[PDB]
Amino acid sequence: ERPTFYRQELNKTIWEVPERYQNLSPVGYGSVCAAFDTKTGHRVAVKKLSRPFQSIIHAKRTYRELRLLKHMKHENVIGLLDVFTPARSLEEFNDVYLVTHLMGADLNNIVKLTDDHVQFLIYQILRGLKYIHSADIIHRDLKPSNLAVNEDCELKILDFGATRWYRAPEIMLNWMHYNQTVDIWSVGCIMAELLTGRTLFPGTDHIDQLKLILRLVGTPGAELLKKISSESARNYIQSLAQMPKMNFANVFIGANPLAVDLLEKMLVLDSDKRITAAQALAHAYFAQYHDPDDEPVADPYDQSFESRDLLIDEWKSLTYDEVISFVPPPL
Numbered sequence: 001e002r003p004t005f006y007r008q009e010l011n012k013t014i015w016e017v018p019e020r021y022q023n024l025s026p027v028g029y030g031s032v033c034a035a036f037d038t039k040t041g042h043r044v045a046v047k048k049l050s051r052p053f054q055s056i057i058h059a060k061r062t063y064r065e066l067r068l069l070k071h072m073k074h075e076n077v078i079g080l081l082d083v084f085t086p087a088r089s090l091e092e093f094n095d096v097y098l099v100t101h102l103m104g105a106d107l108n109n110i111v112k113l114t115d116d117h118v119q120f121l122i123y124q125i126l127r128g129l130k131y132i133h134s135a136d137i138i139h140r141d142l143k144p145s146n147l148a149v150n151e152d153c154e155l156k157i158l159d160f161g162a163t164r165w166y167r168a169p170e171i172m173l174n175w176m177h178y179n180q181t182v183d184i185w186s187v188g189c190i191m192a193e194l195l196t197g198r199t200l201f202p203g204t205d206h207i208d209q210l211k212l213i214l215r216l217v218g219t220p221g222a223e224l225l226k227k228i229s230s231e232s233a234r235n236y237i238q239s240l241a242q243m244p245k246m247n248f249a250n251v252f253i254g255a256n257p258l259a260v261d262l263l264e265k266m267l268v269l270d271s272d273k274r275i276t277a278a279q280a281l282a283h284a285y286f287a288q289y290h291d292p293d294d295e296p297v298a299d300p301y302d303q304s305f306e307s308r309d310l311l312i313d314e315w316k317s318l319t320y321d322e323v324i325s326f327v328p329p330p331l
């Protein structure tokens with residue numbers, strides 16, 4: 001049947017939740033409350049989406065995030081525990097509440113890591129990425145604050161929705177060729193940081209960010225230069241590669257040589273040549289955790305809504321239907 005809801009005001013916001021969610025306490029992320037889930041005995045996070053149907057773009061953003069979260073059924077990716085609305089009908093349908101595990105510990109919050117803990121943490125990012133990538137989805141904003149890590153170094157990829165530090169150079173140069181390996185660049189930047197204890201490319205702006213990248217990875221080779229249409233774009237990328245060249249051996253002095261080999265395959269300017277998540281999992285660096293029988297891919301994900309231009313009401317109707325058809329994961 002439909003649960004009993006109860007109403008309170010917090011941080012001058014009206015919350016209306018099923019009575020199984022008790023002891024709501026605001027945290028930090030927009031409108032988010034820690035809550036005790038009386039059904040399981042476990043603490044969860046309840047998020048009330050802000051102005052979910054305000055515009056076409058918010059409405060599609062609401063739909064997008066619900067469709068994505070409902071799809072994610074993987075150890076190393078945030079899962080959706082519950083979604084609800086107070087509305088008894090599409091007529092009254094206005095607010096959308098998502099329930100997740102309580103994270104409140106990101107990759108920075110947890111780092112001074114041994115080689116073994118870098119292996120396990122980068123292993124879990126790549127296992128999660130393999131999954132997300134297999135369903136034709138790109139994170140685009142992988143960075144330490146978007147990685148939940150509990151006491152036992154267990155890692156989930158999520159998106160709380162400085163980015164430029166972990167951002168692939170092709171995106172900041174506005175190159176044509178984009179692929180899922182923009183996420184691998186990011187993983188390379190995260191791994192480098194876990195090894196050295198400092199941001200690899202702490203640019204103050206996108207031009208500084210690119211100059212710092214090119215100092216390490218080098219000016220484009222003949223092969224890459226071949227794929228760039230514009231003389232002014234080929235001049236400019238060569239323009240930004242004038243800081244005295246650096247070498248990977250020196251930057252990662254004292255790292256496991258296998259880590260350094262894997263970094264050199266991730267931090268490749270030519271995204272056509274960048275190692276994929278599935279290939280990185282098979283690299284010797286992860287021999288202690290790699291199991292080809294336990295690195296699963298995602299079920300097919302229907303992205304055919306991403307290309308659509310629809311009215312607010314259509315986005316809201318599709319969203320309502322996804323709330324109603326939601327089936328909780330097992331206890």
Ligand SMILES: Cc1ccc(-n2nc(C(C)(C)C)cc2NC(=O)c2ccc(CNC(=O)c3cnn(-c4ccccc4)c3N)cc2)cc1
Nearest residue numbers: 027028029032045047065078100101102103104158159161
């Ligand atoms: C527009 C949009 C579209 C899609 C996404 N999207 N994409 C992905 C993938 C699958 C593609 C990666 C995952 C997501 N979104 C999330 O991940 C996400 C959604 C909802 C929630 C709700 N919980 C929380 O906010 C939460 C839980 N612990 N804490 C916490 C507790 C104490 C202190 C600090 C924090 C929170 N603030 C959380 C996350 C995001 C945005």
